[PDB]
Design an enzyme around this catalytic site. Structure first.
Site, short mmCIF file in Angstrom:
data_model
loop_
_atom_site.label_atom_id
_atom_site.label_comp_id
_atom_site.label_asym_id
_atom_site.label_seq_id
_atom_site.Cartn_x
_atom_site.Cartn_y
_atom_site.Cartn_z
N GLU A 44 -10.39 7.39 16.48
CA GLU A 44 -10.23 8.17 15.24
C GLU A 44 -10.84 7.41 14.09
O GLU A 44 -10.73 6.31 14.00
CB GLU A 44 -8.76 8.74 14.89
CG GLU A 44 -9.01 9.65 13.61
CD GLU A 44 -9.61 10.95 13.37
OE1 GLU A 44 -9.14 11.62 13.75
OE2 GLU A 44 -11.00 10.71 13.29
N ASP A 109 1.27 -5.21 6.99
CA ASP A 109 0.69 -5.29 5.72
C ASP A 109 1.73 -6.13 4.70
O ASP A 109 2.96 -6.16 4.43
CB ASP A 109 0.59 -3.96 5.00
CG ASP A 109 -0.11 -4.05 3.94
OD1 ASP A 109 0.38 -4.37 2.67
OD2 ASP A 109 -1.12 -3.34 3.66
N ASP A 111 1.15 -7.20 0.61
CA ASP A 111 0.36 -7.07 -0.60
C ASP A 111 0.90 -7.69 -1.95
O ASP A 111 1.96 -7.82 -1.93
CB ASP A 111 0.20 -5.41 -0.83
CG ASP A 111 -1.03 -5.14 -1.60
OD1 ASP A 111 -2.07 -5.15 -1.22
OD2 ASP A 111 -0.87 -4.77 -2.66
#
Ligand code: ZN
Lengths: 389, 181, 168, 234
Positions: A44, A109, A111
């Protein structure tokens, strides 16, 4: 570095994706040797086109299609999905309900949006090398944890571009993990309990897990350098009131008098260490330990990892705001890695304008590219090995 | 379907029925049974979080229209002829619902779906039988039922008490299964 | 322009006497007798409608083995318009790009593929139901009835007042 | 029939008489009802419970350590009796829950019967892999296991066996961070081992009983088994 102009994007993107992008290299990266029947044909891809137009479902057959579709529309953002039973670009052609994810990556993740209450150096959307210590320590801790606790051998971090990075742990058994497995893992690696801005967000017991012990052992190399020198968290009454909010009130008066009679964060922190040791002897909770865990330990997002069909930025892309290239992170060079030396599309176009398609070598992308071939050499070696034996 | 062996005998106490009509439409509403929804290739139950499918759309439309007509019977001060029209429309909706399952399971039909019909019948048998054992739990006794009616003995001689017993079992089965009527 | 309306009760179709012509029957109001009286209405040119399923990779019709070239809607279009039209005596039709859905038990059928809506007047002979093509796997709507096409494409839900214009 | 405990996931294909068929059905119904009543009356771990249910087993000859007698009759009896109860009990969710409760009681008691030497070969016969760790590995990783262990008091890592398991097998166990992980492999004490195996066994039994519930209408056409199989337990 010069200042970036966001209006040069329509031409700079076209030039970069015409000449410098490592298309076929990324092709091997997501093909993984073509071991599965149509692993890349069900891959994808997600793009963000001009005028903030978002289109989601694309499937591709080969590098020719990748080249043509990339150089035809020139999306601002490149985003990655999962691999399903049939082709996502014709997903509607298959019967409803049959569409289900079967393999996908595991991603972590960290951040700058996770440290608004932590950093005393930058705003929510701003970074600096003197605040990059948290990112470096988070990278190293996640590195050791996945490499030893679970033996995750193919760990790849990719820099997001402005205020964070992304990981890409590409083992096959990881690729075939289930949603329950990934969840249980993410709560296994979750220690910070981010509430409604609760003063205390890290608590421990008397027994210490080797996980947390090793993590803190890594961290102690950075606390003095960052929290007390780069940030100097004990410079003002407001500065250390955040720590006092975690410290029990019976210690507040002694900490206040010690900090007033001192003049620097190092002296105030060593006085805090002495008083905390006295409190531990009297009562343990490891105050020095949870405060540093709450100030430094990575604060993760559950959804991006638990989603079997979640979407995240691809490597080697460009940041719409800052223009930095989403390049992998060199596992050998982490302690001195800097985001402001990351190549920007303007500079790398100027390099090309100042000049078998290997022009990235003449471009500043070259060291990070060699990092990418090193990572994929590791992937190829492991595939060939654990396939032949 | 499932037919219970009758506890044959003479029952002097009160006997009340439980009409199991619109059972199959209620199931098709509840578990989202549809041609666009089931992954036939013995089938399997479709995903609950999945969107409400085609067959549920029209059967639920019929049920809601019947419910609004039922409202129109609550509001009094209406012309009796229009009341009769509302009753006729409600009964037509009832029979159309009841025949919804009919149009899908028969070799006599265009849409003959052996697995889908088998799944619907299995769910109906399961729910009726579950109602059977649990109404046994609630200290009454059942004697006969096949997917369209339930015979219930009462051990009581007060008609109003029997009626409120039926009301309480109806309410509890309605909160156990949402769309069943 | 003169127009009139009626309540339609009956709908008759015949496949051989007057094929392609559904004699709709109904109940009309007349002003001269200030009442309702029996009326007949009929409609012609109820074209038979077909839906060809193009394949994805052209296989040899004799053995089913791949011929090494892909298949397009245009490809199946020519394949039809020369060979099938000549074999089954077709001279006129209106091929159009139409996307439709299938969610039933006919095996090996894409759910939301592209269908060649072949609309030709019913006078030409009806195609065999098991028709197979070198390019298309199968076609639906072979013997699908003119009555049901009328009822289904004219949005006539049950017995409702029918408005007809230009009464010939 | 390679070992006494056995996981019931391969139906028998032999031929038996009607009298033996009813004898097995009734005997296993009696055994499970006795298990229910005894577990209700007593605590599941007391020696009175253990000895009384052992005497029940001996009078109903359903399980024992391997010998000449054990190989042919008792374990086969257990097999066919359990499967005919599957047919009897797959009718309803309530009966399935009841059956699951009593069979978990039965299987936990039987596992308590099995001596520690044979549990290794039992897990090997169970066809799903589990690796026991060596004494040197146990001694080396004792501190890690104790540090990452649940609220079990003290550092004492006694004679309880510790096994090596793929991490995906103990999802609810490790997801609370109450176990050590080494290269995607866990290390676990016996109580949690038996808990894991009973949870997996209940999952497999739930699926199998649902499937047999799908298979009831075909197998009920017989007339000599309907009036029994309707009412073994009821
Ligand atoms: Zn900063």
């Amino acid at each position: 570095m010069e200042t970036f102009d966001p209006t040069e994007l329509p031409e700079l993107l076209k030039l970069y994706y015409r000449r410098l992008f490592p298309y076929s290299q990324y092709y091997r990266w997501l093909n993984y040797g073509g071991v599965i029947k149509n692993y890349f044909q069900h891959r994808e891809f997600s793009f963000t086109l001009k005028d903030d137009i978002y289109i989601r479902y694309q499937s591709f057959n080969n590098q020719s299609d990748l080249e043509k579709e990339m150089q035809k529309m020139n999306p601002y953002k490149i985003d990655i999905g999962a691999v399903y039973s049939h082709r996502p670009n014709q997903h509607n052609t298959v019967k409803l309900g049959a569409f289900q994810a079967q393999e996908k990556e595991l991603v972590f993740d960290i951040d700058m949006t996770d440290y608004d209450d932590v950093r005393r150096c930058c705003s929510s959307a701003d970074i600096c090398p003197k605040c990059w210590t948290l990112m470096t320590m988070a990278i190293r801790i996640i590195d050791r944890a996945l490499k030893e606790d679970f033996g995750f051998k193919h760990r790849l971090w990719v820099y997001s571009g402005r205020r964070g990075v992304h990981c890409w742990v590409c083992d096959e058994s990881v690729r075939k993990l289930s949603s329950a497995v990934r969840s249980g893992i993410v709560e296994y690696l979750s220690l910070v309990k981010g509430g409604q801005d609760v003063k205390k967000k890290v608590h421990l017991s008397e027994k210490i897990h080797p996980f947390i012990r090793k993590s803190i052992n890594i961290i102690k190399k950075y606390f003095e350098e960052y929290a007390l020198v780069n940030q100097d968290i004990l410079e003002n009454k407001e500065s250390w009131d955040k720590i006092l909010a975690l410290v029990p009130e019976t210690i507040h008066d002694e900490l206040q008098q010690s900090f007033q009679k001192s003049h620097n964060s190092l002296q105030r922190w060593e006085h805090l260490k002495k008083v905390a040791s006295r409190y531990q002897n009297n009562i343990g909770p490891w105050l020095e330990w949870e405060i540093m865990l709450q100030y430094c330990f990575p604060r993760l997002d559950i959804n991006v990892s638990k989603g079997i069909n979640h979407l995240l930025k691809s490597p080697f892309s460009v940041h719409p705001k800052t223009g930095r290239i989403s390049v992998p992170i060199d596992l050998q060079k982490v302690d001195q890695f800097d985001p402001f030396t990351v190549p920007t599309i303007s500079f790398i176009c100027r390099e090309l304008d100042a000049i078998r398609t290997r022009d990235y070598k003449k471009t500043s992308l070259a060291p990070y590219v060699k990092v990418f071939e090193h990572f994929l050499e590791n992937l190829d070696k492991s595939r060939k090995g654990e396939l032949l034996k | 379907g499932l037919v219970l062996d009758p506890k044959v005998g003479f029952y002097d106490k009160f006997i009340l029925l439980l009409d199991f009509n619109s059972l199959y439409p209620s199931i098709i509403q509840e578990f989202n049974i549809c041609f666009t929804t089931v992954q036939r290739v013995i089938p399997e139950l479709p995903d609950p979080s999945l969107e409400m499918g085609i067959l549920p759309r029209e059967i639920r439309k019929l049920v809601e229209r019947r419910k609004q007509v039922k409202q129109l019977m609550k509001q009094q001060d209406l012309n009796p002829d229009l009341i009769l029209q509302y009753d006729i429309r409600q009964k037509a909706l009832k029979l159309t619902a009841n025949s919804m399952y009919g149009c899908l399971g028969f070799s006599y039909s265009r849409f003959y779906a052996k697995p889908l019909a088998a799944l619907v019948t299995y769910k109906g048998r399961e729910i009726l039988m579950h109602t059977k054992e649990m109404v046994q739990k609630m200290n009454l006794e059942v004697i006969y039922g096949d997917t369209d009616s339930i015979m219930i003995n009462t051990n009581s001689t007060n008609l109003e008490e029997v009626f409120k017993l039926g009301n309480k079992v109806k309410s509890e089965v309605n909160k156990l299964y949402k769309l069943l009527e | 322009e003169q127009v009139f309306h009626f309540y339609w009760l009956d709908a008759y179709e015949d496949q051989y006497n007057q094929p392609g012509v559904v004699f709709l029957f109904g109940k009309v109001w007349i002003e001269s007798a200030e009442t309702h009286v029996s009326c007949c209405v009929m409609v012609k040119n109820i074209e038979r409608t077909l839906y060809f399923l193009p394949r994805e990779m052209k296989i040899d019709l004799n053995t089913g083995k791949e011929t090494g070239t892909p298949i397009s809607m245009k490809d199946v279009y020519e394949e039809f318009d020369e060979k099938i039209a000549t074999k089954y005596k077709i001279m006129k039709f209106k091929s159009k790009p139409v996307e439709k859905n299938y969610a039933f038990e006919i095996p090996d059928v894409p759910e939301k593929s592209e269908y060649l809506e072949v609309k030709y007047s019913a006078e030409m002979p009806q195609l065999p139901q098991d028709l197979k093509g070198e390019t298309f796997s199968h076609v639906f709507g072979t013997n699908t009835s003119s009555l049901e096409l009328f009822l289904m494409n004219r949005k006539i839900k049950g017995p409702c007042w029918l408005e007809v214009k230009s009464p010939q | 029939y390679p070992h006494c405990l056995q996981f019931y996931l391969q139906p028998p294909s032999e031929n038996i008489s009607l009298i033996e068929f009813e004898n097995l059905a009734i005997d296993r119904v009696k055994l499970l009802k006795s298990v229910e009543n005894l577990g209700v009356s007593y605590v599941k771990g007391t020696e009175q419970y253990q000895s009384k249910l052992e005497s029940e087993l001996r009078k109903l000859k359903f399980s024992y350590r391997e010998n000449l007698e054990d190989e042919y009759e008792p374990r086969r009896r257990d097999h066919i009796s359990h499967f005919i109860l599957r047919l009897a009990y797959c009718q309803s969710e309530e009966l399935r829950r009841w059956f699951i409760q009593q069979e978990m009681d039965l299987l936990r008691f039987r596992f308590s019967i099995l001596p520690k030497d044979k549990i290794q070969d039992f897990l090997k016969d169970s066809q799903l892999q589990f690796e026991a760790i060596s004494d040197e590995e146990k001694t080396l990783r004792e501190q890690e296991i104790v540090a990452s262990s649940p609220s079990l008091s003290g550092l004492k890592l006694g004679f309880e066996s510790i096994y090596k398991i793929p991490f995906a097998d103990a999802l609810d166990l490790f997801r609370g961070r109450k176990v050590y992980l080494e290269d995607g492999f866990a290390y676990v004490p016996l109580k949690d081992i038996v808990a894991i195996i009973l949870n997996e066994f209940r999952a497999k039994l739930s699926k199998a009983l649902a499937l047999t519930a799908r298979s009831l209408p075909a197998v009920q056409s017989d007339e000599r088994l309907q009036p029994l199989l309707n009412h073994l337990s009821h």
